[PDB]
């Protein structure tokens, strides 16, 4: 449910970044993968090799960005409660008073509705693929990384 990537430096200190990522290999195939004669006529074709070695092809990676989560906000009678749960959360509301910021503590917005507010968890420790199905990081322009891909 969470992806962790780390390493060890020269000063013997280990740093690791953790990102919430739902990992469950799903169905992915376009055939039955089965020959085919052992000996026959030789013809030119193309296939994806099984070499894991970091060469040729590459994908774009970036910060998760601020991962949106609607479960962070809760309607406390006539006010909105933002339950942090030991995470850095970026909030924004339509209502008056405090309507922006980066909170580390539990916050409450007086006289507001859940639909009039937006909250997201800020991870900046881990890397994530530049996916069109995931939103772009708000406090970031075109800052991105790249990793070599197998097959």
């Amino acid at each position: 449910e969470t992806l962790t990537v780390g390493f060890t430096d020269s000063r013997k200190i280990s740093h690791s970044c953790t990102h919430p990522f739902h990992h469950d290999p799903p169905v992915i195939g376009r055939e039955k993968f089965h020959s085919r004669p052992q000996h026959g006529k030789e013809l030119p074709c193309s296939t994806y090799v099984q070499s894991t070695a970091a060469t040729t092809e590459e994908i774009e990676v970036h910060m998760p960005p601020d991962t949106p989560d609607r479960t962070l906000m809760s309607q406390q009678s006539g006010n909105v409660k933002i339950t942090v749960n030991g995470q850095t959360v970026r909030y924004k509301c339509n209502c008056g008073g405090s309507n922006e910021g980066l909170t580390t503590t539990d916050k409450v917005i007086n006289n507001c509705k859940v639909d009039q507010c937006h909250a997201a968890v800020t991870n900046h420790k881990k890397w994530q693929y530049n996916s069109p199905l995931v939103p772009r990081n708000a406090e970031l322009g075109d800052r991105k990384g790249k990793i070599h891909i197998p097959f």
Partner: antibody
Amino acid sequence: QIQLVQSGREVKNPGETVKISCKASGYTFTEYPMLWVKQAPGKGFRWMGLIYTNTGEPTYAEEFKGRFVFSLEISASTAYLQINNLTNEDTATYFCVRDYFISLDYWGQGTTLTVSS
Amino acid sequence: QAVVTQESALTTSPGETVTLTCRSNIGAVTSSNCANWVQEKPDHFFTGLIGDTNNRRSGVPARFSGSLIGDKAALTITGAQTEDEAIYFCALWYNNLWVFGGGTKLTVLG
């Protein structure tokens, strides 16, 4: 359903310590933390802090960081307020309260302390 | 480091509609202040009415509703009753602590 019943009222001469209990009934202790409020004779209502009845971490209001110490007999659904080195101007009533629904929903009966030689 | 202000006393008659307000010294009250309304009846008897601006505690009559009116949190008693004569306190959340208002003494004919 929910009853927070508090200890009875004490008298204590300056310098002493007091442990005020709050015995909770009707809810699962663990999913709702406790607010401790001071309603001072004249002055009105004041938040003293909140205790995470799950982890056990207390928050103190800055006015209360120091002589005040929140703790809990988890096991018996009790939260407790302890005021050490009692000052004479601590006479007042202290309420325990349940934090829920983006505010406080139930208040206790109050335990009144009269600091007096 | 914020000061919640409430009307001092309000007098109404049974059957009327009365509004109590809760003002914050720092700015407009918003839904992230999670306005709470608490009632104190004689004998140091406290009950919570509304939380998170407009959530009515369970078993609190419907004549009670909360909302934000302008830049402040408000409690409206629709069809005030004789039984509603008490002190109403508002509480506002400020990112890390709660600040209580001075309370409004409400008097209802009956």
